[model samples]
Target: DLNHLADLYDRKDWNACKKELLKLKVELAKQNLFVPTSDKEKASFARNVFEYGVLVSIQTCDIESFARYASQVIPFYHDSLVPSSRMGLVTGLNLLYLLSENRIAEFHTALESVPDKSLFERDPYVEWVISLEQNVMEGAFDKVASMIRSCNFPEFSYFMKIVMSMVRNEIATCAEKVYSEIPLSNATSLLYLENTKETEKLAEERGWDIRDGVIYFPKE
Candidate 1:
């Protein structure tokens, strides 16, 4: 029976249990399965193997790989998704999957992807995250306190409180330790803060709030 299942999968039979396994493998690869290999040679080998598996899996109509990969692929093109262009490809794929399974939650989550640009927008929450990241990079106490105060994300307010406490305690010096504890290299994008050290310090010295955490919008 097991051999028969494999035979059905190999022959591209739609009604086989093993068919889903093939679909899963293909979708996992499209999700950019970052293989964790310390050795360069081994990493190449892993990617090659996964690529081969994807080719075989795509032959079946059971598009499990497409569903799994859609999540990661969509995030890479956030701007496109917001503007509804090539970004629609991933969103469409996600909708198809949700409809097929009749999963309401999945459908809502997929739809939410388009309007979630606030994370990258010129808001206090965005500034606070960027400030922390910059403080880590510059290894200095940048005057990001005012920027943090202007952020108004109710859901993330508690997280901001923690960040404020850390800043007050001179925690910027622990950048090296924090950097070592997280996977900073795999960050999908970089945030550029607007204010220079001199300007931010001057605002602080004068006891005036600095609106220095504007989002870095790259020139088109």
Candidate 2:
């Protein structure tokens, strides 16, 4: 029965299963299955809920729920949960998520709750993200391209790419206000984009023009 729910989970049927998780929780309670003479069923049930909820949250890009549920439980550690040991990876991802979303107060709150001072100091993944957040927060866009070149964790890469996109957008705004033009290759290098299509998409979003492979910014 629960295994079927796990399958629905794997299929990414989040809306269906999220309701099912809660529904099953209540149904089991009514059956008095949460208590027993011998099985310790309640703790086991809670553990499964937290674990599954983490998977759903990550799949759905619902980082706030991940923080609310998985972070409180502490052992899942996102990717660090079981298959392999990768401390600070989940924490790092959560930190990146919070930073990407501009939830600065909550970011510092999460930062303060780590078990000890050494988590950041000991893990390169953790240190990398923490520094990345600081750079983004500091308006240090010019240095970001160099910093991202050193990034090693794929889990961390997704959010950093978002951060770089944000930085490039800000740069575009200021460039448009001041000079109104920069070569397309220069924009490509500055934004750390892979190629022309992505840069064109980014420019399209900003209503900037690209002609002859040169980006023409909207004038101030």
Candidate 3:
């Protein structure tokens, strides 16, 4: 009977919604789900929930809330050294990018923890990400552009577009900050825009065809 409630929810059978809701409460009580724990453990558990919830929330209309929860979850993982784990580098970089709205020192610290930069060269998408980060820090748009231009693969062109979108979003968020932005001396905004433009220019030079503006990369 309880299992049937899940079937109802999955099927979007609205008539069984009330019964399903009551069943979830009963299940929670049966499991004693609210037992108290140490504050540290509670916080850690909350971070885990928040991280997973953010992923699911992204597919819905709650992006603002997702970003808020992601901000909290990211620091928890980063501070605990979890970000150094496999595939964690991406998470760490994303957190650092988001945290750039403040915490300049913390952003630099986190950026330094990312894995070796050379490893991204083989993958166009990752290469673009790494190049963008480097260009931001070093104010070397031409250098990034050169590297992007050297990649002849069509997928690289598409990857560049996605990376540029991310850069634009970050720049937009950081513009209205009440305090001074970090790396204010590095010319981050110009470098990002220039590198993005260079990538697009190279894509055009190669006569690369854009299909529905979608970029697909091969899985390793």
Candidate 4:
């Protein structure tokens, strides 16, 4: 029954996958199969389906959908009737999502509420998020940028792009307040952009003036 959803997700057709997942969810709900069941196979199937929903939502950048699907699947994770391998991965992804949204308090609260703190301490998927929170708290954007660029986490690439952009922009704002005029090379490093053209584009977007090789920030 869920074969098509699996195929769509494997094909990376995120929108179609989301639609199929929602349709399947409604079907499951109508049959009262949306929650954990004493029948292990049925319960496991339901958990896997919602896990797919969570992934599809994130791929489409639909946080509302992610939250809904994620919350729906949590009970299954908590229930021993259906053990989900995705528990660690999904939990870490949600933490990263909260961090990317700048929900600092929520991030810590979520961390504290985990059923297994060892996951955050030992699981590669989650450990990096804890490291990132520490780095962010320390104002270590350079290390954050490097960690993101070098990240080998399979599903983290999406949030890495988001968090990197936020971090770079924050640094840009700091630079604006600190320096009236700076060299193009310095600005490139300061903003963590890989190329001069990109830095130039960013400077232009920020309404900074470029004369010769220097970027001059306008007075606020």
Candidate 5:
């Protein structure tokens, strides 16, 4: 039988699914099927529940809940129970999450957790994160910013925004000290903003002066 939560999940009703999931967990626990078991049948059931939670958490952009669900689902993946196609996708997101927070050490440690290291290059999801890490390390902010629009996965946007803003702020700080006068167009691209208008807003907020399509940074 399909999980009772399937209807709401398939409809993308995240709010209702979240509520139903809590009640479903209670029901599963009452039957001693809320966690792994030697009984393959019950184990799969438990795995599926947690897997749904993982996907739902990502859809909702709840990183705390995502962390909890991902950790809970790890055992299922480790045991080869209820085999999931989402393994790479979820792991990539976890790596991206660490990267967004500038946790380079933790990112490498998590990368090491994957038995088939080749996935770093082979899997689409993992490959994207790997490429992003490389670009960030190279200080290729343009490539990093471009990836915001080029990326295929919707779930990646939340973390990518964090990464992009970090890159923008870093570049902004450097530009403030490095250049006294720069074209507004150059500043727009440097800060990875969408247009010159937004760049003007940023310039005004930062106390920079703008005239004749150029920005003048304040001297120290």
Candidate 6:
């Protein structure tokens, strides 16, 4: 595969990069999807392809496909011959995916899969994700925003943004479940939107009612 082929992601157009990546996969399939003879070579090739597939899936917000690609790569990730440096970031993305899916038991298990818990604490992005998980459990979604702001993990640029959305939506659900009526401004902040217009749009999407700047959650 052309190395510059992967560089198309630098254009960062989700659909454009996606088409290019898919074309690459399709072209490879023409050769019956050749596999490397050696375990090391196979692991190396799997790593590159998984890296591309995962990014494309995530960019498209196709979390299911992302998980599919992730599962295939993670086993190869454990091979002694494979370079393990990217594993932590990939694992972080997996954790974020599980969290978004609300697979609590699996999320915790995935975290425990790391042999060295102490080492994870040293990785800033991973550590924040751990905290994000805990905060979600405790209904401290508000704190997750602060964590995102403070962590500044370039590695988390995409992953955390999506995680943050899930957390915000969860909080929005909680807001409706608990508050009969909440100020639109407060809802705006709770939903992480820029202003009332955004909050108005969001409220409409959630089938909420807004009257005189107060968002009213329908009674059950």
Q: Give per-residue CA lDDT, model 6, range 33-152, as digits (tens).
A: 333324565447656767777766776778788888888666654445544555666777778777766788998887777666774688655676788889878878668777776766
List clashing residue pairs in candidate 1.
27-65
Over 4 Å off, model 4: 1-4, 36-40
Give per-residue lDDT, candidate 4, residue 23.
87
Ranking by lDDT: 4, 5, 6, 2, 3, 1
**Candidate 1 runs further than 4 Å off:** 1-59, 78-86, 116-220
Per-residue CA lDDT of model 4 for 140-182, tens digit only, reads: 9889988887898868877878888888888999899989999
Clash-forming residue pairs, model 2: none
Residue-level lDDT for 133 in candidate 5: 93
Model 3 per-residue lDDT at 178: 31
What TM-score does structure 2 among the candidates reach?
Answer: 0.66
lDDT of each residue in 1-220, candidate 2, tens digit only:
4676688876879998788777876775676543321344554454466556655676676767777755544543321223223235656767777887788898887778776668778877678878887887787876677787776675556567778777877876677777668887777776777787888898888888888888887764
Off by over 4 Å in 2: 1-52, 60-87, 146-150
**lDDT score, candidate 4, position 105:** 99
Candidate 6: Cα lDDT at 70: 85
| Candidate 6: clashing residue pairs, number | 0
Residue range 12-78, candidate 5, lDDT tens digits = 8999889987986887789887567788887777777887887788889888998897777666655
Model 3 CA lDDT for position 3: 49
Minimum summed lDDT over a 10-residue window in model 1 is located at 183-192
TM-score to native of every candidate shown: 0.25, 0.66, 0.35, 0.88, 0.86, 0.73
Lowest lDDT sum, 10 consecutive residues, model 4, at 77-86
Query: Regarding TM-score, does 1 or 4 come out ahead?
Result: 4
Model 5: lDDT of residue 118: 80
Top candidate by TM-score: 4
TM-score winner between 5 and 6, please give it: 5
What's the lDDT of the predicted structure labeled candidate 2?
A: 0.68
